[PDB]
Structure 1
Amino acid sequence: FERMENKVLDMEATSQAAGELAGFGIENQFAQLEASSGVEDELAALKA
């Protein structure tokens, strides 16, 4: 459990560092573009 917990703390610290340092606002702009693309396919399905 001590060896496992030390690797879990390394993975959690790595996961925090990635989301904290590099979770940039542009990823939410890409998610808004993906949602807008999904709405355009629903409008194409409605048109069909």
Structure 2
Amino acid sequence: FERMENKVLDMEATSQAAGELAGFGIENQFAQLEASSGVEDELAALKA
């Protein structure tokens, strides 16, 4: 169980490496995606 537990920490360490690099300018494009999402909500209000 200790042996497997170390592997879990390795995955968490990999998650740390995976998570830290995740940050990119793409986050700005998500705001555009959410901005476009409001359009359908605005159109949804038009349907209402």
Give the structure-2-normalised TM-score.
Answer: 0.55
- Cα drift, residue 23 of structure 1: 2.5
User: TM-score scaled by structure 1?
Assistant: 0.55
Q: Structure 1 residue runs of 4+, over 2 Å off?
A: 27-32, 34-39, 44-48
Note the residue ranges of structure 2 that are not aligned, 5 or more in a row. Answer: none
Count residues in correspondence: 48
RMSD over aligned CA atoms reads: 2.7
Q: Residue by residue, what CA displacement relative to the aligned partner does 1:1-33 show, whole Å, maximum 9, x if unpaired? A: 211111101110111111102332413533651
